[PDB]
Amino acid sequence: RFSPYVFNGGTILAIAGEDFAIVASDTRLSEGFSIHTRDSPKCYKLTDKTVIGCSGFHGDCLTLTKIIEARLKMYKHSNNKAMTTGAIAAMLSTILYSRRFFPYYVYNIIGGLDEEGKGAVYSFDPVGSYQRDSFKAGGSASAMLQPLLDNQVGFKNMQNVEHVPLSLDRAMRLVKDVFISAAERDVYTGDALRICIVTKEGIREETVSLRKD
Amino acid sequence: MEYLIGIQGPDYVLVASDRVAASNIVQMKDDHDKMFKMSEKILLLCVGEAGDTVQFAEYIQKNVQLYKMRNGYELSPTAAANFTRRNLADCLRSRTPYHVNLLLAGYDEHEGPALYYMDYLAALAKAPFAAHGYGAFLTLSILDRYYTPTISRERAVELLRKCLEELQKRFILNLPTFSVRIIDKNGIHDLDNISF
Amino acid sequence: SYDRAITVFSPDGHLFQVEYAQEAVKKGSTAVGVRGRDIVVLGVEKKSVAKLQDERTVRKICALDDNVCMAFAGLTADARIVINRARVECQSHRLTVEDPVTVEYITRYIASLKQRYTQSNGR
Amino acid sequence: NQYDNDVTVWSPQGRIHQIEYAMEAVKQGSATVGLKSKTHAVLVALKRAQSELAAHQKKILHVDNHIGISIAGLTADARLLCNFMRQECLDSRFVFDRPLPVSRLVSLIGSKTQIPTQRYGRRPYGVGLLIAGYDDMGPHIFQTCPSANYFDCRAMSIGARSQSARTYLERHMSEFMECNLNELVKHGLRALRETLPAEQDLTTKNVSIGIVGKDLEFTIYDDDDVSPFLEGLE
Amino acid sequence: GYDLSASTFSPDGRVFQVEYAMKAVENSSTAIGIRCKDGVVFGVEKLVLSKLYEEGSNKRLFNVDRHVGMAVAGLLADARSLADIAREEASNFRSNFGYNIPLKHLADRVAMYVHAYTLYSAVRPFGCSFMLGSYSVNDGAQLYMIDPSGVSYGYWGCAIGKARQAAKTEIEKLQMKEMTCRDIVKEVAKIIYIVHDEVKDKAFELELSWVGELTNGRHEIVPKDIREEAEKYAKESLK
Amino acid sequence: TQNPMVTGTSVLGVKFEGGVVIAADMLGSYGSLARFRNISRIMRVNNSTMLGASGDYADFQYLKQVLGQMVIDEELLGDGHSYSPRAIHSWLTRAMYSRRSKMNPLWNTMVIGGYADGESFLGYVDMLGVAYEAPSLATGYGAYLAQPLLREVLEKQPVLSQTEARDLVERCMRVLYYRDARSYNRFQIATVTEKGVEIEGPLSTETNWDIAHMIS
Amino acid sequence: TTTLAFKFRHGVIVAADSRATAGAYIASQTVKKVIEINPYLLGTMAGGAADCSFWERLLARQCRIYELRNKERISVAAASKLLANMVYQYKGMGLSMGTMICGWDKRGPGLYYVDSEGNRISGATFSVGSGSVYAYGVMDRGYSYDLEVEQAYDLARRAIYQATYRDAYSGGAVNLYHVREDGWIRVSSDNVADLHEKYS
Amino acid sequence: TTIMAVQFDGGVVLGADSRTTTGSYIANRVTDKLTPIHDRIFCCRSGSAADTQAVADAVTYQLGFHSIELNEPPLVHTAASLFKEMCYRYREDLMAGIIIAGWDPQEGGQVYSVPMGGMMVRQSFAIGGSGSSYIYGYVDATYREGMTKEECLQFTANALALAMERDGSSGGVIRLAAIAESGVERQVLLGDQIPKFAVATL
Amino acid sequence: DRGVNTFSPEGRLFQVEYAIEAIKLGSTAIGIQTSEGVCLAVEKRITSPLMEPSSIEKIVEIDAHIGCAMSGLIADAKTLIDKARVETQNHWFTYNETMTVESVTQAVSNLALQFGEEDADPGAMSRPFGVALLFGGVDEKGPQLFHMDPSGTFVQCDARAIGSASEGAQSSLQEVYHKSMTLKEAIKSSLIILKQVMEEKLNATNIELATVQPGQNFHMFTKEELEEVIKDI
Ligand SMILES: *[B]([O])([O])[C]([C][C]([C])[C])[N]C(=O)[C]([N]C(=O)C1=[C][C]=[C]C(C2=[C][C]=[C][C]=[C]2)=N1)[C]([C])[O]
Ligand SMILES: *[B]([O])([O])[C]([C][C]([C])[C])[N]C(=O)[C]([N]C(=O)C1=[C][C]=[C]C(C2=[C][C]=[C][C]=[C]2)=N1)[C]([C])[O]
Ligand SMILES: [Cl-]
Ligand SMILES: [Cl-]
Ligand SMILES: [Cl-]
Ligand SMILES: [Cl-]
Ligand SMILES: [Cl-]
Ligand SMILES: [Cl-]
Ligand SMILES: [Cl-]
Ligand SMILES: [Cl-]
Ligand SMILES: [Cl-]
Ligand SMILES: [Cl-]
Ligand SMILES: [Cl-]
Ligand SMILES: [Cl-]
Ligand SMILES: [Cl-]
Ligand SMILES: [Cl-]
Ligand SMILES: [Cl-]
Ligand SMILES: [K+]
Ligand SMILES: [K+]
Ligand SMILES: [K+]
Ligand SMILES: [Mg+2]
Ligand SMILES: [Mg+2]
Ligand SMILES: [Mg+2]
């Protein structure tokens, strides 16, 4: 039994704001008990308005992102405009389902701006199920990040708190905190945190150091 | 789980079938019908695997109706039985086998009433009475005990009722209602459902 | 297999094979239809008489399904092919929709069969 | 005559009339011009409008970030060929993660468009292209023909009355390599304008422009976006 | 009429469609090859049909394997397709048999492919003739020429295209068996300048390539400096 | 390949200022048997690019055949364009992925080193299409025994000279000979710089066995 | 998941929970399990998330094509049949889908259960999903064809609620729809926590 | 099986045992495992009898046709390449451990191994089959650069004899062949002619 | 007799040119694009009072935001219309968005030259389509009208006529059209023009009219809505 899959680790995260989207990931690429490299981000720019995070089996992450890139150009050639965030999401759903019987071992989260300039996050399972979310964690440490986001961004289980709009600054603080917490406990998450901030002005990049053990 | 029965008298065939569609621990439908009208004087009763049963019976039904349209007269119960058989047998070793068990009941102008039994392997047997499903195990000996070839249709319905009462008493599955139809010289007649 | 283009355009936008097919129809026996209020009727000529003919075997009115029939004029062998194709289709429709065909449905099916035989190689 | 209906029939002069007839489809298309400097490749095209109320036919098509085309001849053939080019480009980025060199894409076109010239019942492609590109060897202008031959050009014009545009380009071609972008596009427009009846002028409605170079992905300029380039033909 | 298909013989036993294809090669400008002591040199009279074309546009000299050059005349799209066939054949040979294809075998294989297009109404003959040249220590220098009928022979010297005969008569003056490639390039340039009709077709590029001991059995373009000298020699020799 | 037959062990690579060095022993093993003791597991792909392979040696010879032919095809065109190290690494990633996706892998783990346009390239590809770049790589047991030493040096001094990279590789090859039971003390070192690709060998490391007398 | 539907005098009630799971991990609490096939036809999702979404989206495509070609609304019978015929070909390949196709056409209110095993059946009431057994108990004890509209809403909501309570794999919110003769309406979305407050 | 070949200046020597087995029944005790592929090119076969016979007949066809076409003797390297292509392509369906050896005018005596899996490597000498395991240490100690033809024959006959004594799947007679420009000389060592090494009694 | 993919000495495919002549045998259709929507109007061309007028359908819905008017050999239009419908639904399926009018027109136009007798499947298209099409709709570029003919050439038009009287109708269109024209004006204008060009007396059963507006889906005018617009005209 040749196995066509291996697990390569990686955590991803996206948050939708009023006028921004964050997509973040760690930079470790692992296999078994080893580190392949400390500098392998899991976020990929798709358009000026849309970034995708991908973790799971790296051979599929590479292939799938290359397929998405080709399809964005095919769309643009045939329709004379860039794909929207929502159209990329819908298309990804069908590409994943096309491999329903030999799946891409990839967890995907899209973050970007919708057609009204608002933050949008779409999260996927490996065979193409998806929905829009306000925020989402994925990959190796997702069970560690998700509950905290539920609580701190969703305000779940909290009484006597004003449900205020999420500022970029607080969203940023949250993202750095949860990955730092994840680097404490998930062996696969570490080395560095890469953060992409999508706004009307473009996409900018921050990087934060994480533990190397 | 699904019960079919047939009893052929001198000039009619009586058939009945349970009305349950089950799934896991629940009845999902209590007025299910397992009979398919092929022609004016032919019923096909079909049970077995989900999907296969309807896909198979409707394919037969459409082709028998097509035969009527192309030729202006209907396939005899025996021809239709052998047509049904040819299809099932030809699919047996294919990529698309159909996991279905059947009875075919009919009345021919010249041959009189007929009842055919077929299993999923596509063995075909003509019989004076027959049944399919686990319930057959508890009712065939009731039929052997009381059937006679000249049995009148009133006593056949009584005989049928004995079978169905035996399921209520002895069978572990809850089959509370049955469709009952008869076929003769004047076609297909719906009788009252037998219910508990 | 034989892939010759048979129906092609000529100068001025004619499709000569189709026109010639229409000439075949014009030499066929007359057929008439009237749509009543709650009846429909079809009548057709002849064709030749002939006492030694079995009448049953040459009708030009044909059931397609229980609720749809047709008459034709033209090449009777061609008609038989169309009729049988339509009869098959009526059974697919009932199969996948569980209604009888509308008359328009099966008309549209026949029409599109006929169109395809004006634009397909070898036919 | 007996020699002009099949691409598989050589005439007694060593010609293939069907291929020559296909070339006529390009000579009757509206003119387009392509030229290059050291740093940029430019396409300029006249768009024909059917009526006074029609938009004006697209002449310039995007192929990849580093490649665009201008067309003359059968529009349906132009799209089929353009779709082939696009796919060849996507394939090379998929396989090798780098742009398909322009001269290799053109070779693929020659090889693809030759095939139906040699098989019975097939026909040539009835379109000619000007191809603008930029890769490691710098800017390029190529031309392709229905004969499946292709050419590497300092500059070129094809379509109706292109002879005029070609003369203009020969007259000024020694200036092109050293031109800044604006100068180069001006030259393309002046060449194209030679193809017009004396009455008629370049307008924002009839001119389309395509540019690619070192710092610039293949970009199309139509309608109001051509006005910067048309002002200061002074 | 008897000349519309390669699958129809005329009553005299000719295949006119192949002859017509040959006429397309004879309308083309001239290419020559010469085999010599230590290799093979090719030269082509490459007519420049517009000053708008780049130097090197429409090459008529190709590398079909690392050791094998090809020189063509005729319809250029057909020649290029044949250069692809030859490439594919050399590539497949290396994959299957594990060594560089011998010139003669390559010539014979691509000739059979050319031949296959001279039998059928379904396809037309190729409108090109081509030469194949190589050199190795083991096989020495070899020059083959294939025509549209699929005939293939080996040569000491060869010319194809419209001044074929004039070129041959000049090639016959050379004692090429005793000359080196470095000497022969000059003579190739000389011969192209002799047969070029400067009244009738105004401008041409000389295209030169070679394969021999001096290139270590690789088929390569003649370097620019050597070509320019050969041109200058040819031009002054014309005087 | 479903079942690998003759196989090679680790391949190492490290970037240095002006190039990349790769190393691989010269052994083909047939299970535990050290069967073919003079085979090269390194390929010069073109002037800018070299490849070394672990795993099934027949599958490597197939890749070599295929890749060698692609480079010849490209050279025939004489058009000023060449496959960069990165392009060859891309090609190789697609080829392994595609074979993995047909459930018929090429059973290899590979290290691609190159030098083009002033940049050192070093990239990994495995039989499943997992591919990435890094300043140093090591396949097989090298991932466990050599990579820790490469990374430790690199963290103190990310930019190595050629001679430092070579010495560091030699130390790694010694450790492998001590601790990998499928290694062999006959190896090649291949280096790519501005000047092209050089393959040196057969090479051996010095070894020390003083610990054989430190048991009592 | 828990989904239910029932026909009654005033149309068809359709309700669902909103939870998705990957093994025991709660993947989402906000899944939309009722899909708008057209303005008079709903499909419910239970089983594999990707499978249900894909095949119901494909069904919506096909129904729309049908409507264009035929110049009339597809029947509930025909729509449900298209779905069964699509999935039949995949039996045994591990698709997991249980759906109810709910509409109102020329035969009046329509409700079909269709699944990846190949079943297709018409009926008055159904519940589908890991919570269905719990929904059936409550729905069956309160159901009547002559339920008033607001009573029908109460029943559906309560049946899904009670299923969310017992079944670890159902939860989130209860989403409720009503198919009427002139179209479906979205009637309410109630978080199960807010319903808990209310029903005690 | 035990198969071997050795290069010398001007040619090659090949050898094999002659045992075919099914389980531990000897289905042929005098098998000829050295099969001529062309006038001066042989293959030594081990593994599946059916597979190596089918592959050898196929390569014999390919090589013969190629050789007629070129009008020259084939290269040993070509014969090995053709075995390699077929053994590699079909590595999942074949059990074939092959040695190709012979003489051609361009490269002289050559030995190639194509072991299972379908790799190909040229060697000074090669051994294969199940019995080769038992002679690695012997051939590694005894091989000397520059052996004559006669020395190659004795070296081969000794190695094979040693393997045959130990390997239950090898035995019978030793078939040898020497190939050079002058042609192919075959012989059989049987019975007392097989080299003899005492069982080490107390 | 020559092959279907034979070029003339002018560089045109004979079959395509002849297909273009077949368009002139069709009834006149008109499209007009305004900032408030597009209208499509078509002469039915009734040949017998016994024919049912509503069974002549020369304007069809492609999708909710796109209609299509045809002229020429109507039977040929069916596969084109079906292709447009399938394509827009595919696009919706895959991308969850409506397909642009331009993109639909492109997709259909790529079938145009796909005929021939020795490249293709056992009984593929033998000849081009004898039809011209006006696609009118609204997408994110706003209202839009596109024309396509049997060459596979397609283009946006502010206003266009096709079929028998298209010269004529096109001249009147250049006369009446203006960029700022309202949709109601456009409707009236195209009914005035049909009335001129038609052999029969215009009325509410022998024409069809449809609109698409940024507000509102494809809408076929009813008998009664046509009668209303006919009063002034
Ligand atoms: B309900 O039936 O309990 C619900 C239905 C609805 C349509 C979501 N079904 C599920 O929650 C199913 N879950 C998934 O299919 C699922 C959710 C998240 C990830 C994955 C996944 C699929 C392939 C490979 C990895 C992960 N599936 C059901 C509970 O399984
Ligand atoms: B050697 O490798 O030990 C020898 C070499 C061979 C002659 C080229 N191989 C064998 O003896 C092998 N035997 C067979 O392949 C063989 C011969 C006859 C019948 C069968 C057989 C196979 C399957 C089922 C029934 C019988 N095998 C041996 C090592 O397997
Ligand atoms: Cl058909
Ligand atoms: Cl044009
Ligand atoms: Cl055109
Ligand atoms: Cl040309
Ligand atoms: Cl031109
Ligand atoms: Cl010649
Ligand atoms: Cl070795
Ligand atoms: Cl190498
Ligand atoms: Cl919800
Ligand atoms: Cl449909
Ligand atoms: Cl039912
Ligand atoms: Cl072996
Ligand atoms: Cl072996
Ligand atoms: Cl023996
Ligand atoms: Cl028109
Ligand atoms: K960690
Ligand atoms: K044998
Ligand atoms: K033995
Ligand atoms: Mg650690
Ligand atoms: Mg089955
Ligand atoms: Mg076998």
Side-chain angles (χ1 to χ4, degrees), chain G residues 3 6 11 27 32 40-41 46 67-68 78 86 100 110 112 117 128 144 153 158 165 182 185 188:
Chain G
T3 58
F6 55 88
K32 298 294 187 261
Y40 53 80
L41 247 199
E67 167 179 9
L68 292 163
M86 281 190 300
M100 297 169 292
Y112 279 79
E117 301 293 85
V128 195
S144 167
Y153 298 170
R158 190 66 128 144
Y165 188 68
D182 69 333
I185 50 169
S188 57

Side-chain angles (χ1 to χ4, degrees), chain H residues 1-2 127-136 159 162-164 167 169-170:
Chain H
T1 294
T2 311
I127 55 179
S130 60
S132 60
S133 299
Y134 307 120
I135 52 166
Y136 280 100
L162 292 163
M164 287 156 73
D167 184 21
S169 306
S170 305

Side-chain angles (χ1 to χ4, degrees), chain I residues 20 23-24 71 132 147 160-163 165-167:
Chain I
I20 286 161
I23 307 328
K24 307 260 59 164
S71 187
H147 168 263
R160 181 68 172 246
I162 59 174
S166 59
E167 303 155 2

Side-chain angles (χ1 to χ4, degrees), chain F residues 125-183:
Chain F
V125 186
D126 73 9
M127 68 169 179
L128 307 179
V130 173
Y132 59 93
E133 27 189 285
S136 64
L137 300 172
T139 62
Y141 265 92
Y144 300 118
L145 288 157
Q147 191 69 301
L149 301 171
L150 299 166
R151 295 214 286 234
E152 190 277 328
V153 166
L154 267 18
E155 203 248 21
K156 280 129 62 110
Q157 186 186 324
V159 176
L160 292 176
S161 84
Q162 183 171 168
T163 56
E164 288 171 328
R166 174 56 166 279
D167 298 337
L168 175 62
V169 167
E170 291 168 342
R171 285 160 47 202
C172 298
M173 297 301 291
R174 193 185 302 110
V175 174
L176 297 169
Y177 183 58
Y178 287 146
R179 295 286 165 170
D180 179 355
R182 303 282 182 282
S183 67

Side-chain angles (χ1 to χ4, degrees), chain A residues 31-117:
Chain A
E31 183 156 333
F33 288 85
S34 291
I35 294 168
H36 273 309
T37 165
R38 299 187 195 277
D39 189 13
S40 178
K42 307 195 178 75
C43 320
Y44 305 74
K45 182 182 168 181
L46 298 185
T47 67
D48 288 343
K49 277 191 288 151
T50 309
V51 172
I52 192 173
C54 313
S55 55
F57 162 48
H58 191 61
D60 284 343
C61 293
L62 292 176
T63 297
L64 176 67
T65 49
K66 289 180 66 109
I67 291 171
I68 295 166
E69 289 174 325
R71 292 289 304 268
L72 291 222
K73 295 166 94 127
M74 291 154 72
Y75 177 101
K76 168 175 283 151
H77 291 155
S78 99
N79 304 284
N80 313 298
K81 52 159 307 187
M83 287 189 66
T84 62
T85 294
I88 292 163
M91 175 185 74
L92 185 55
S93 180
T94 64
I95 288 169
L96 297 171
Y97 201 79
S98 73
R99 291 286 288 269
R100 173 61 177 72
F101 302 113
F102 189 165
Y104 296 107
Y105 183 9
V106 184
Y107 295 92
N108 288 285
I109 301 173
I110 294 163
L113 302 181
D114 64 22
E115 292 298 272
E116 291 162 50

Side-chain angles (χ1 to χ4, degrees), chain B residues 2 90 99 142 190:
Chain B
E2 308 176 281
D90 287 355
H99 297 149
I142 300 183
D190 286 356

